[PDB]
Amino acid sequence: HAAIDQALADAYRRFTDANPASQRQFEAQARYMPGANSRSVLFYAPFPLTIARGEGAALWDADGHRYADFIAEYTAGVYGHSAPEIRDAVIEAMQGGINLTGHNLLEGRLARLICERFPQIEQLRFTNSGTEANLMALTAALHFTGRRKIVVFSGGYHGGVLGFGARPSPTTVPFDFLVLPYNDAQTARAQIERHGPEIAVVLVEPMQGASGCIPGQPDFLQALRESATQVGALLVFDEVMTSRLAPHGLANKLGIRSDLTTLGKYIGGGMSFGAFGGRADVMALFDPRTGPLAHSGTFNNNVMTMAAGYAGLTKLFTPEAAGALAERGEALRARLNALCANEGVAMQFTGIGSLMNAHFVQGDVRSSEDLAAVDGRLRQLLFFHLLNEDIYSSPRGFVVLSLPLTDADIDRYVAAIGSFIGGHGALLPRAN
Amino acid sequence: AIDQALADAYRRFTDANPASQRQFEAQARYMPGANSRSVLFYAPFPLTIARGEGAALWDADGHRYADFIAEYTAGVYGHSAPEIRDAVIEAMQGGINLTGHNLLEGRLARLICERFPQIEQLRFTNSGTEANLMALTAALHFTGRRKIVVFSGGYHGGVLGFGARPSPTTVPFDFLVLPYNDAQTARAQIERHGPEIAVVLVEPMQGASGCIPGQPDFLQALRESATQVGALLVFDEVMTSRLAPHGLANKLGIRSDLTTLGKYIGGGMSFGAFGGRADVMALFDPRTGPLAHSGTFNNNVMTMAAGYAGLTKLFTPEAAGALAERGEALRARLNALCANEGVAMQFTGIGSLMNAHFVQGDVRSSEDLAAVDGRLRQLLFFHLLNEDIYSSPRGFVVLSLPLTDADIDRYVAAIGSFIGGHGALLPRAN
């Protein structure tokens, strides 16, 4: 314990001494934004690195350190940092004029493409973020059903004002939430049945992202579909992260159909983006000719997003590319798990396809409860260790593949995990 | 008579725009009513906009219009400003989706804090809606209270709209909805529910309800009562921040605890911000504060670059003031014209923002407009299209930097022709 404290203090010091420009920048920025910060996930102690430049799957900090990027804008940056297909589409759109203040020539074609790639989406609308998409989805479900109660799950993350521990987070909007255990099929069935008439919607990630890439089990997710249908509630799949996991998203891979689906991240080509869609009869609430619900938002249909999204999905992150990237991720996750098992350490990587997360526990991880006892200092040691090995990762150990990452890049990550185990044998919890 | 005039307008508009009609029918398949943003829809179908340059727009059928709506105040720079485009290209060449603190966000944060000194610290969001949601969340946690005072006709974003009651799309916070520009009801209700009230949220001029200025005595009553009671005052200046060199609140000399921003501040890119008192913003300091606020595109280099470029090179404080003066002169001409012709018609608002209304007398709240014949607005809208003017269905008129004095003359002229050709349909003054 005292040895871990000491290794961490050493990590902080080396990180500090090697990054004076990032420190200077942090001090200066702290005057105008709380903790110099506009986005909580980007902050880490002692201070976060300022990123100066990006190209392909490479990033450079303010002090000129070059890293292989293994976080890729928290799944939004699947195209890498400098894709010409994206840039040229944005440029052409700007030359056509921006802020066009009307229905445009670009939105319809992106909407079509999305509905075709995700056939469970009969109609959709665009929002400016995943947080907005989920808000609008929940708003629609409450009005469509005439009910107020929303079922969500422990560890669930659905945006800036829609996060949950065992209870709603301090920033979570005061909808009537019923928070149930993730991957507990029996409790879900019972609680949904018991409160049937009150439940407007069951909102769930098919794999939880923020909580640590925790796959939703077949039985649990089928139970949610059956229970919701039973009591007359809408099932909403949050596929903001999860849609990239297979050629047509994770829900379709699993064979489960939700009433509504929310999207975000990469679908806007790396531009600000969200969307909510599903059954045409639910979406009809927003049909301005006949529906009772209004949904405005200044930048909903902006030409930059509309252009960059269509370019990205058609030229780069195609359904086939999504399958192929998922294959690489599975291969990677298997190598990492075999390594951890072989070295006898209480360490694993959980996830699906091109998304995984480091965890310092032995055994099956089925919910965030299984990670409650974990020593958070261990994640930090790994993060700083990866920086030393020219790898830019997430503080939470969230590993995210992007298209430009080479097989050699992947090898470097595996080697870095290996050197981490071998350097910290005295410090890491044992498997048994 | 009005029914027939409206049917004729629909016919004329339909026949002149078949490509827009065809685009609409095809788009209706994948988006409800072909639509992703409600304000953009109007009957019988909305124009598809194909191109923009300066303060000009082209529809799918090739018509060129002078632009008098300008992305609902967001498009203050026009549709093709080189300073914005060059700044965005520059940022893209340095790489996008940078996944961390970057070199551009601090410049823009400092700029906002300096130009709007009521903002000591801020955080960026992806829209005005998020900014308002985050500010409300901050206020509730800071005060430890639940009740939120808002005003009828108030619009604060997609899930924060109010008539006399919250709109069906509004998040179920504990809202107390009060009449706009009613100082006596505001004072009595705020004191009655004092210890429960975390926050008073108000636009210093209501936008969506029809450019209705908040009266000084009313807005001061809000500041006074909020302070008296221990509630935070939040000014929603998403629209209103453009109205003076340092925003409307500063023009009026009133200081809110928090301010929300949006629209043009991100240079034409997706943008929102909330900020104010450093001690309230401390709740979000990741080092010591209990509140978390992520959001993947919050600090994106595109927005950071365009925002800084627009605010330093184009829509400077001086430019904001000059545009407001041109707006004041336009509104005065329009009101003189309407009074001249004896019609029950007027333009309300401040500076570069105004709104057509078919009533006589003082417009103080949405109640004053409840009984207006909506067909007159449509008639005006279609008439302006005929005169190659692109405005909003609701009669919202928005100035932008590239609009020439000759463009503005055309707008006045077109209202003149509107009055003179529809004199038999318009309500009379007195």
Ligand SMILES: Cc1ncc(COP(=O)(O)O)c(CNOCC(=O)O)c1O
């Ligand atoms: C005072 C005020 N606050 C907040 C807002 C919300 O800002 P945003 O649309 O960026 O969420 C708006 C306007 N939002 O406009 C809708 C549209 O033009 O489609 C607003 O007027």
Ligand SMILES: Cc1ncc(COP(=O)(O)O)c(CNOCC(=O)O)c1O
């Ligand atoms: C399942 C899910 N839904 C919704 C969201 C929220 O989407 P958005 O951040 O676009 O509001 C997220 C992730 N948002 O990440 C925060 C950040 O990277 O700063 C998400 O994982």
